[PDB]
RNA sequence: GGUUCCCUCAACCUGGACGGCAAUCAGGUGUUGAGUGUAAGUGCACAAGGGAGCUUGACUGCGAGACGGACAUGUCGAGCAG
C-alpha cells in the first residue's frame, strides 16, 4: 500500500477569532491548524470546495501536501469539525508527518457478501485502530459475511490487515454480529 | 385539594464580608459560613458557629495550604 | 502480665500409660497429671473394658 | 521468588509515629523568639534540634553520636541526660531562653523525659 | 416534666447561684456538683434544692 | 534459662529442616509461628448472662490467662441480637505461654478425641494460617468432667510467618499436627 | 408505552427548548435513522405509534432502535378549576428533543423498504424530520 | 459537656463447631462510598468519627473590634483579673 499526497494551497491567516473565522467561511474557506512535532502551530486557511473533494475520494485519513507561501509540508488529517445540521466542515486539524513515521489511525470496516437467507447482520463497531506508515494507510477495511450461519461473533482480531499494519485496539472487539433474523413477534415485544 | 408546602426560613446573610486586599481591624469578621469551607490561616480565628475573624490588623489574603482554602491576614508596614 | 487477674499457673508433669513423661507448665494445682493416651499411644500417630469382657468370659 | 504478604512491623511502626507527630504539630510551632525542640529517638541514640518554623531553619542541635557522649558509662537514659545538657548550653549560646517541646510522637516518659528534665535544670524553660 | 429546672445552692452559705436542668429519671437524686460561689470567693460544693 | 520443648525442638531441629526443602535466600525468610488465638462464639448469650459467664471460666483453665468478652458490633433482629452486649470471648497467646499450649494440644488433648481421625490439611487460610474447630471441650485434663455442664467448643487458629499454604503445612506438620492423607 | 420505574422528583419545571443537540446527533447502531429539525416534547404515546408504524412495514426481519426515552413528567391541573391551590398531578411523559437529535434507527436488508418505513414514522411525530445514514 | 492520650471505618475475597448472606475469630484488599442523638445543607479521615483516665468552664466582674439590621430583636469575638 502506497499513497500520493494531495496538493492543497494553504494561506497563513492574518486575523484569528470567532469573527474572523465566520468571515472566512462565508468566503468559502476552512480554518485549519498545523501542529505536530513542528512544535509551532500554524493557523492556515484552505479552499472549502477543494479540501472536501480530497476527503470525498480519499477518506478522513487523507494525506496532504500543502503549499504554505511556497514551501511544501507533508500533513495528515487528524480531526474534522462538522456542523450537525448543515453538515459543514467548520475546522480541521492537521498533524505534521514525515515519510517512515508510524501513526495510530482509525479506519472504517466495510461489510460485504450475502450470508444465510435466514440471518440478519448487525455491525457493532464502525471503526478499528491500526498503526501504519505515513503514506501506507489503507483507505478501507473489508470483512465478508458469506455462508455465515446463525450466531457468529466476528472479532476485531479476525480482520485481514495488509502488510506493515498492526492492530492497536484489543483483538476481542465485536465488529459484526450475525444473528437469526427477528420475527414479527420479536419486533413487537422489543421496545414497549 | 390544597398544597402541603409553603414554609421557608429567614435568609441568614452568609458569605464573604471582607475580600482580598481589604484592610481590616483586629476582631473584625471576614467570612460567615456553616462549616469550614474556608479554614483559618495566620492571624485568623474560628468562632463558635464557624465564623472567621481577624486576630491582628492587616490586609485580607486568601490562600491554599495542603488542599484547604484558607484566609490570612498580612500586616501593613507603617510609613 | 497483670498481677491479680490470671489463674494460678504452676509447672506440672504428665505421665502416660506407655511410660512416657514430660516436663510442662499448666494451671492444675496438683502439680502432675496422668493420661492413658499420648503422641506415642494413639493409633493414628503410631499407625498400629468392653474388649476385655468379651475376650475373657466368651474367649 | 519470595513475595511477602503483609506489612513488616517496621513499616507499621514508622507510619504510625509520623501519623501521631503531625497530630502533635497542629499546635506547636517554632518562632525565632520561642523555638521548637524536636526530639528523635531510636534503639541506639537520641537526637534534638531547635527549629524555626517560620523559615525552616535549624538553630542548634545536640545528639548522642558525638564522641564525648559515647564515653559515658551509664545506660541509654544516662546518655539522654548528657544530650539534654549539651542542647541547653547551645541554646543559650544563641540567645534562646524559652522553647516549646516537640516530643516527636513518642510517649513522654523514660528517655524522652530524662532529656527534657536535663534541659530544664540546665537553664532552658519550657 | 421529665427535664425540670433545678437550682444549685452553695453548701456553706446556702446561696442560690445557678439554675439548670436535669432528667429526673436518669438522675433521681439531687445533683451534686462543684461551682464557683461569688460570695465565698472559691469553688465550693453546690447541691440541688 | 531453659525453654519449652517445642521451642527447643523448633529452634535447632525444625528451622533448618525447612532450609533445604524450600531453599531460602536469607534466614529471615524462614517461617515461624506468630500467635495462637482461642475463640468461643457463644451466640445464645443474647438470652441469658450465665451462658457467657461459663465460657470465660473454662477458657482461663484451658490456656492460663483471663479472656476478653467480645461485645456485638451490630444489632441483628433475626438473631434477637442487640448491639452492645456480650456475645463471645477471646484469648491470644504469645511467647512461652504459646509453646506450652501447642505442646499440650498435640500431646494430650488432640489424641483424646473420640474416634479421632486427624485434622484436614485443606483448612488453611489462603496465605499460610490454619484454623479448626471442636464440637466439645472435654478433651482437656485441666477441667473436671463432673462439673462440665454442656459442650462449648473453641476455634483454634495458628498464625504463621509462612507466605503460602504449602509452607504453612510444612511448618505445622513438623510440630506434629496429625494431617490426614488426602 | 415507555414509562420510567421511578423518578426522584415528580413535579418538575418545563424542559428548556433552546439550542441544538450536543450529543446523540449521529447514527451508531442501525443503518438508517430519523434526525430532528425542530424542538418539541415527544410523548411516549407518539413514540409507541411511531415504532409500530415501522414494524407494520418491514413485517418480519430487521431491527429497530429507539434513542430517546420519556423521562420528564408534565402535570395537568384538574378540569374547570380556577387558578391557584397548588400544582397539578403529572399526566404524560415527554422527551426533550432539539434539532440534530437522532430519534429512531433501523437495520433492514434493502434500502427502499427501509426508507419508506421511516417516512411512515415521521408522519406520526409533531416535528419536521429527515432520514440520515451512517456515511459522511 | 471540658481536657489529655491512643485508633481508622463501610464493603469485598479466603479459612473456621453448632452458625446459616449476615453474630464472635483469623489473614488480605480497601482514601472514604461507613459514621456524625435528631430534617436538609455546608463540613469533618489532619478527623468534628471510635476507645480510655481525670473532671464540672453547662464559671463570677468585664469585654477592643465587627456581622445583621424600619425599630424592637438576633449573632461573632481576641484579651484582662478572680
Ligand atoms: Zn458559698
mmCIF file of C-alpha atoms in Angstrom, chain F:
data_model
loop_
_atom_site.group_PDB
_atom_site.id
_atom_site.type_symbol
_atom_site.label_atom_id
_atom_site.label_comp_id
_atom_site.label_asym_id
_atom_site.label_seq_id
_atom_site.Cartn_x
_atom_site.Cartn_y
_atom_site.Cartn_z
ATOM 1 C CA UNK F 1 17.458 -20.491 81.383
ATOM 2 C CA UNK F 2 15.631 -23.400 79.731
ATOM 3 C CA UNK F 3 12.962 -23.386 77.032
ATOM 4 C CA UNK F 4 9.678 -25.124 76.256
ATOM 5 C CA UNK F 5 10.184 -28.371 74.377
ATOM 6 C CA UNK F 6 8.534 -27.214 71.144
ATOM 7 C CA UNK F 7 10.566 -24.007 71.096
ATOM 8 C CA UNK F 8 13.643 -26.118 71.819
ATOM 9 C CA UNK F 9 12.548 -28.558 69.120
ATOM 10 C CA UNK F 10 11.769 -25.756 66.665
ATOM 11 C CA UNK F 11 14.969 -23.805 67.281
ATOM 12 C CA UNK F 12 17.517 -26.332 66.003
ATOM 13 C CA UNK F 13 15.586 -29.261 64.554
ATOM 14 C CA UNK F 14 12.778 -27.613 62.569
ATOM 15 C CA UNK F 15 14.248 -24.302 61.389
ATOM 16 C CA UNK F 16 16.953 -25.914 59.268
ATOM 17 C CA UNK F 17 14.571 -28.678 58.178
ATOM 18 C CA UNK F 18 12.713 -26.087 56.097
ATOM 19 C CA UNK F 19 16.010 -24.693 54.783
ATOM 20 C CA UNK F 20 16.808 -27.409 52.235
ATOM 21 C CA UNK F 21 13.158 -28.130 51.434
ATOM 22 C CA UNK F 22 12.381 -24.573 50.297
ATOM 23 C CA UNK F 23 15.892 -23.187 49.627
ATOM 24 C CA UNK F 24 15.553 -19.726 51.131
ATOM 25 C CA UNK F 25 17.938 -16.857 50.390
ATOM 26 C CA UNK F 26 18.020 -15.338 53.900
ATOM 27 C CA UNK F 27 17.427 -16.851 57.315
ATOM 28 C CA UNK F 28 14.922 -14.015 57.757
ATOM 29 C CA UNK F 29 12.562 -15.777 55.318
ATOM 30 C CA UNK F 30 12.261 -18.973 57.381
ATOM 31 C CA UNK F 31 8.641 -19.199 58.590
ATOM 32 C CA UNK F 32 7.773 -19.291 62.260
ATOM 33 C CA UNK F 33 4.651 -19.122 64.431
ATOM 34 C CA UNK F 34 3.380 -15.691 65.442
ATOM 35 C CA UNK F 35 0.443 -16.310 67.759
ATOM 36 C CA UNK F 36 -2.416 -18.672 68.547
ATOM 37 C CA UNK F 37 -5.902 -17.306 69.240
ATOM 38 C CA UNK F 38 -8.652 -19.228 71.043
ATOM 39 C CA UNK F 39 -12.241 -18.136 70.406
ATOM 40 C CA UNK F 40 -15.707 -19.170 71.580
ATOM 41 C CA UNK F 41 -18.679 -17.683 69.780
ATOM 42 C CA UNK F 42 -21.397 -18.169 72.376
ATOM 43 C CA UNK F 43 -24.188 -16.734 70.247
ATOM 44 C CA UNK F 44 -27.041 -17.707 72.563
ATOM 45 C CA UNK F 45 -25.695 -15.304 75.197
ATOM 46 C CA UNK F 46 -28.390 -12.918 73.934
ATOM 47 C CA UNK F 47 -30.869 -14.921 76.045
ATOM 48 C CA UNK F 48 -29.037 -15.308 79.368
ATOM 49 C CA UNK F 49 -25.992 -13.920 81.150
ATOM 50 C CA UNK F 50 -24.982 -17.264 82.676
ATOM 51 C CA UNK F 51 -24.006 -18.528 79.213
ATOM 52 C CA UNK F 52 -21.179 -16.038 78.656
ATOM 53 C CA UNK F 53 -20.070 -16.382 82.285
ATOM 54 C CA UNK F 54 -19.455 -20.116 81.960
ATOM 55 C CA UNK F 55 -17.325 -19.846 78.824
ATOM 56 C CA UNK F 56 -14.800 -17.423 80.325
ATOM 57 C CA UNK F 57 -14.487 -19.691 83.368
ATOM 58 C CA UNK F 58 -13.344 -22.676 81.299
ATOM 59 C CA UNK F 59 -11.172 -20.716 78.875
ATOM 60 C CA UNK F 60 -8.926 -19.479 81.680
ATOM 61 C CA UNK F 61 -8.275 -23.084 82.707
ATOM 62 C CA UNK F 62 -7.551 -24.204 79.141
ATOM 63 C CA UNK F 63 -4.940 -21.517 78.406
ATOM 64 C CA UNK F 64 -3.888 -19.830 81.641
ATOM 65 C CA UNK F 65 -4.990 -16.211 81.360
ATOM 66 C CA UNK F 66 -8.102 -14.073 81.619
ATOM 67 C CA UNK F 67 -10.161 -13.679 78.418
ATOM 68 C CA UNK F 68 -11.913 -10.733 76.812
ATOM 69 C CA UNK F 69 -15.678 -10.534 76.459
ATOM 70 C CA UNK F 70 -16.258 -9.612 72.822
ATOM 71 C CA UNK F 71 -19.345 -7.418 72.508
ATOM 72 C CA UNK F 72 -21.561 -7.337 69.442
ATOM 73 C CA UNK F 73 -20.761 -4.603 66.930
ATOM 74 C CA UNK F 74 -24.194 -4.707 65.265
ATOM 75 C CA UNK F 75 -27.862 -5.124 66.164
ATOM 76 C CA UNK F 76 -29.459 -8.051 64.314
ATOM 77 C CA UNK F 77 -33.199 -8.634 64.634
ATOM 78 C CA UNK F 78 -33.247 -12.114 63.075
ATOM 79 C CA UNK F 79 -30.861 -13.324 65.790
ATOM 80 C CA UNK F 80 -32.529 -11.312 68.583
ATOM 81 C CA UNK F 81 -29.148 -9.595 68.881
ATOM 82 C CA UNK F 82 -28.866 -6.007 70.120
ATOM 83 C CA UNK F 83 -25.533 -4.230 69.787
ATOM 84 C CA UNK F 84 -23.554 -3.693 72.968
ATOM 85 C CA UNK F 85 -23.945 -6.959 74.883
ATOM 86 C CA UNK F 86 -21.642 -9.958 75.401
ATOM 87 C CA UNK F 87 -21.586 -12.499 72.590
ATOM 88 C CA UNK F 88 -18.241 -14.245 72.915
ATOM 89 C CA UNK F 89 -14.748 -14.458 74.356
ATOM 90 C CA UNK F 90 -11.172 -14.488 73.098
ATOM 91 C CA UNK F 91 -7.639 -15.285 74.275
ATOM 92 C CA UNK F 92 -4.396 -14.763 72.366
ATOM 93 C CA UNK F 93 -1.149 -16.459 73.370
ATOM 94 C CA UNK F 94 2.402 -15.351 72.599
ATOM 95 C CA UNK F 95 5.913 -16.240 73.666
ATOM 96 C CA UNK F 96 6.484 -19.096 76.088
ATOM 97 C CA UNK F 97 2.804 -19.463 77.008
ATOM 98 C CA UNK F 98 2.037 -20.187 73.350
ATOM 99 C CA UNK F 99 4.541 -23.032 73.130
ATOM 100 C CA UNK F 100 3.186 -24.948 76.130
ATOM 101 C CA UNK F 101 -0.340 -24.810 74.721
ATOM 102 C CA UNK F 102 0.937 -26.160 71.410
ATOM 103 C CA UNK F 103 2.807 -28.785 73.431
ATOM 104 C CA UNK F 104 -0.276 -29.928 75.342
ATOM 105 C CA UNK F 105 -2.686 -29.667 72.403
ATOM 106 C CA UNK F 106 -0.724 -32.148 70.292
ATOM 107 C CA UNK F 107 0.474 -34.429 73.091
ATOM 108 C CA UNK F 108 -2.651 -34.788 75.254
ATOM 109 C CA UNK F 109 -5.848 -33.125 74.038
ATOM 110 C CA UNK F 110 -5.827 -33.959 70.323
ATOM 111 C CA UNK F 111 -5.439 -37.770 70.683
ATOM 112 C CA UNK F 112 -8.136 -37.750 73.398
ATOM 113 C CA UNK F 113 -10.832 -37.022 70.799
ATOM 114 C CA UNK F 114 -13.156 -39.993 70.409
ATOM 115 C CA UNK F 115 -12.674 -41.888 67.120
ATOM 116 C CA UNK F 116 -10.016 -39.318 66.272
ATOM 117 C CA UNK F 117 -9.114 -39.266 62.579
ATOM 118 C CA UNK F 118 -6.632 -36.398 62.461
ATOM 119 C CA UNK F 119 -7.193 -32.945 61.003
ATOM 120 C CA UNK F 120 -7.888 -31.998 57.405
ATOM 121 C CA UNK F 121 -4.973 -30.191 55.706
ATOM 122 C CA UNK F 122 -7.229 -28.096 53.446
ATOM 123 C CA UNK F 123 -8.413 -25.750 56.222
ATOM 124 C CA UNK F 124 -5.537 -23.333 55.620
ATOM 125 C CA UNK F 125 -6.263 -19.608 55.434
ATOM 126 C CA UNK F 126 -5.076 -18.922 51.903
ATOM 127 C CA UNK F 127 -1.841 -17.216 52.958
ATOM 128 C CA UNK F 128 -0.458 -19.780 55.406
ATOM 129 C CA UNK F 129 -2.639 -19.814 58.533
ATOM 130 C CA UNK F 130 -4.567 -22.779 59.923
ATOM 131 C CA UNK F 131 -7.837 -22.765 61.856
ATOM 132 C CA UNK F 132 -10.086 -25.563 63.079
ATOM 133 C CA UNK F 133 -12.960 -26.067 65.480
ATOM 134 C CA UNK F 134 -14.081 -28.515 68.162
ATOM 135 C CA UNK F 135 -17.612 -29.691 68.905
ATOM 136 C CA UNK F 136 -16.775 -30.174 72.590
ATOM 137 C CA UNK F 137 -14.385 -29.095 75.324
ATOM 138 C CA UNK F 138 -13.897 -32.210 77.496
ATOM 139 C CA UNK F 139 -10.609 -33.178 75.811
ATOM 140 C CA UNK F 140 -8.595 -31.114 78.328
ATOM 141 C CA UNK F 141 -7.242 -32.520 81.586
ATOM 142 C CA UNK F 142 -7.444 -29.153 83.369
ATOM 143 C CA UNK F 143 -11.236 -29.470 83.733
ATOM 144 C CA UNK F 144 -13.339 -31.822 85.854
ATOM 145 C CA UNK F 145 -15.852 -33.881 83.886
ATOM 146 C CA UNK F 146 -18.390 -33.930 86.726
ATOM 147 C CA UNK F 147 -18.519 -30.121 86.785
ATOM 148 C CA UNK F 148 -18.973 -30.000 82.994
ATOM 149 C CA UNK F 149 -22.398 -28.645 82.072
ATOM 150 C CA UNK F 150 -22.707 -28.578 78.276
ATOM 151 C CA UNK F 151 -20.339 -28.800 75.306
ATOM 152 C CA UNK F 152 -18.744 -25.468 74.435
ATOM 153 C CA UNK F 153 -16.152 -25.792 71.697
ATOM 154 C CA UNK F 154 -13.414 -23.468 70.541
ATOM 155 C CA UNK F 155 -11.940 -22.096 67.306
ATOM 156 C CA UNK F 156 -8.189 -22.665 67.447
ATOM 157 C CA UNK F 157 -6.235 -20.635 64.893
ATOM 158 C CA UNK F 158 -2.458 -20.614 64.431
ATOM 159 C CA UNK F 159 -0.802 -17.594 62.806
ATOM 160 C CA UNK F 160 2.464 -18.214 60.965
ATOM 161 C CA UNK F 161 5.024 -16.206 59.013
ATOM 162 C CA UNK F 162 4.761 -18.618 56.068
ATOM 163 C CA UNK F 163 3.922 -16.890 52.796
ATOM 164 C CA UNK F 164 1.683 -19.590 51.294
ATOM 165 C CA UNK F 165 -0.210 -22.693 52.378
ATOM 166 C CA UNK F 166 2.485 -25.024 51.029
ATOM 167 C CA UNK F 167 4.981 -23.627 53.531
ATOM 168 C CA UNK F 168 2.248 -23.405 56.163
ATOM 169 C CA UNK F 169 1.700 -27.165 56.108
ATOM 170 C CA UNK F 170 5.435 -27.863 56.225
ATOM 171 C CA UNK F 171 5.916 -25.949 59.471
ATOM 172 C CA UNK F 172 2.800 -27.316 61.161
ATOM 173 C CA UNK F 173 3.439 -30.992 60.381
ATOM 174 C CA UNK F 174 6.947 -30.613 61.800
ATOM 175 C CA UNK F 175 5.392 -29.503 65.087
ATOM 176 C CA UNK F 176 3.262 -32.632 64.926
ATOM 177 C CA UNK F 177 -0.242 -31.800 63.760
ATOM 178 C CA UNK F 178 -1.905 -35.041 62.534
ATOM 179 C CA UNK F 179 -2.816 -34.166 58.958
ATOM 180 C CA UNK F 180 -4.975 -36.640 57.064
ATOM 181 C CA UNK F 181 -3.727 -38.330 53.899
ATOM 182 C CA UNK F 182 -5.932 -36.802 51.210
#
